[PDB]
Design a protein around this ligand. Structure first.
Ligand code: NAP
Ligand code: NAP
Ligand code: IIG
Ligand code: IIG
Lengths: 266, 267
């Protein structure tokens, strides 16, 4: 159930977020916005020298507080422990924003199984492990998990097979536990963000060789959705998608199945 | 794009087909239907005994031939070589049917990342591995890859998170490379089967305590029908509401409002 207010920067002030993939692009902007709202941010990325710059410029923008921990999400242990640390560092946690991904480029898929596996590992399994680790704290606070996905995690695009596989997976997994949290009275929201082409560095480089959209706002929308506990956010420069992307039938089928079968079965 | 005729059992006659998870359940039914049709058949699962039951019955039903090879699709090496063996045993491959999943049961998700990882490995990664290994023969025959899925890989459900993740992923991957096969002019069909509850042994066991299951035998027949006709998806569920609502014609619109709306010559 979305909080039925409208968004206001106040909602974030004093709140204990975590952004991953915060060293650049969308993730970075998010830490900043968070900063401008006076959140306790705890950033993360592989780039340790760069994280500092970001933390530092977050304190400059107004953060209640701001730290970074640098690790690779290829590593499940790092991911798990990371969350504990960001905990102690911030004295609990209100919001897990899960944004990072492994590198990829635009190519037909031919036989790089290793790239498929790694994409699943970094883009998906790590998100879960982050999740499992962070759930306890979030229960205490009735917090939120925000998950950054893409049009290509809703509809099919060539040249990004591995990456799509992993974005879909996020939908499947997280929508599913959303059903579960609900039939279990576990009061943690989960927001899935579906983004179109955004003007990050990485994206602009790979496509340079379509209309992109402003990374500053995209990041703000992500934060709004999360704050308002919406199930979903759509953010694309086009106006067909925002309207054609939503799946009313899916919603109907879920409704039917949910109100027709207790889940109190066990 | 599909064949333009209604289905005929003949279409499978002489065809060479792999079926996985074919010792029991929907797999087994698929072997059986294939046999009655006179296709060569290689079936695989972990248990050599149950397989043997099945190979022996496909022979009696009038397979052109029928064999089995055992291993677990937890093992990528096995998955890769498995397809080579099977291709030798038949001198080719017309259809790759991907059906197996890791044993899983109905539970709230709590902890078991290992179950999340294993489900991704078996239900998803192994399929990519199988396809990669089989694509050279499939090109050569202009055949078909059939990927077995579930309503829960098109909409959310409680109690099957891990599984559902792995099924969505199948939609993402396989629907993406289908878009690729189109622009690379690869003449191999990809069919994604979306299944509601099916009265297989294992499913019925898990749901013993009002849910309407659909019949394994017809289900298995629809999959093979959608495959042979090279359709993009097959929906099969006991409910007509569901079979109608599950379609997503918008999504096919967006995908097309980009297909032509942009250029893939570079790649
Ligand atoms: N930009 C778009 O057009 C587009 C479209 C739709 C959705 N999105 C989504 O937006 C989110 C962020 O994308 P973006 O464009 O901001 O990407 P980006 O600029 O390329 O940033 C990726 C972030 O994740 C980090 N990262 C990369 N590999 C990592 C690893 N192995 N372990 C830990 N961190 C790693 C990177 O920093 P380090 O290398 O320093 O670790 C960086 O901070 C992604 O989920 C993406 O799918 C982007
Ligand atoms: N029944 C349903 O309600 C339902 C609904 C939607 C979709 N589906 C899809 O239907 C497909 C078939 O399901 P089913 O219900 O027919 O299942 P099933 O009868 O339980 O069959 C599972 C098959 O997979 C094999 N298998 C299990 N683990 C394996 C492994 N590690 N490596 C290789 N093979 C393995 C099993 O044999 P061994 O144990 O001998 O290894 C068996 O042959 C699945 O993809 C499922 O998601 C089923
Ligand atoms: C990692 C990287 O930045 C990236 C950036 C954006 C996306 C993404 O989410 N896309 C869908 C639109 C939202 C892209 C948009 C760009 C295109 O349509 C390609 C086909 C011509 C692919 C789909 C995926 C990866 C990459 F790959 F460019 F490096
Ligand atoms: C492994 C197993 O056979 C299985 C069989 C079927 C499915 C499946 O695809 N389902 C969707 C409808 C198609 C299930 C139907 C069963 C339920 O709705 C659960 C909530 C009570 C879950 C969704 C998943 C797993 C199991 F777990 F039942 F044994």
């Amino acid at each position: 159930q979305p909080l039925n207010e409208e968004f206001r920067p106040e909602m974030l002030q004093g709140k204990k977020v975590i952004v991953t993939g915060a060293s650049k692009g969308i993730g970075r902007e998010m830490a900043y916005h968070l900063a401008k709202m006076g959140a306790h941010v705890v950033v993360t990325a592989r780039s340790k020298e760069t994280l500092q710059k970001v933390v530092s410029h977050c304190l400059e923008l107004g953060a209640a507080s701001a730290h970074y921990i640098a690790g690779t999400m290829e590593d499940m242990t790092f991911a798990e422990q990371f969350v504990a640390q960001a905990g102690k560092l911030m004295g609990g946690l209100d919001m897990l924003i899960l944004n990072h991904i492994t590198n990829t480029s635009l190519n037909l898929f031919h036989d790089d199984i290793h790239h498929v596996r790694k994409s699943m590992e970094v883009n998906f399994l790590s998100y879960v492990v982050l999740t499992v680790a962070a759930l306890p704290m979030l229960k205490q606070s009735n917090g939120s998990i925000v998950v950054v996905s893409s049009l290509a995690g809703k509809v099919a695009y060539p040249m990004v097979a591995a990456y799509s596989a992993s974005k879909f997976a996020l939908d499947g997994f997280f929508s599913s536990i959303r059903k579960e949290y609900s039939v279990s009275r576990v009061n943690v929201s989960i927001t899935l963000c579906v983004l179109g082409l955004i003007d990050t560095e990485t994206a602009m480089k790979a496509v340079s060789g379509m209309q992109a959209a402003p990374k500053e706002e995209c990041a703000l929308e992500i934060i709004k959705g999360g704050a308002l506990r919406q199930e979903e956010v759509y953010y694309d420069s086009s106006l067909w998608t925002t309207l054609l992307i939503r799946n009313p039938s899916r919603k109907i089928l879920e409704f039917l199945y949910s109100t027709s079968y207790n889940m109190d079965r066990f």
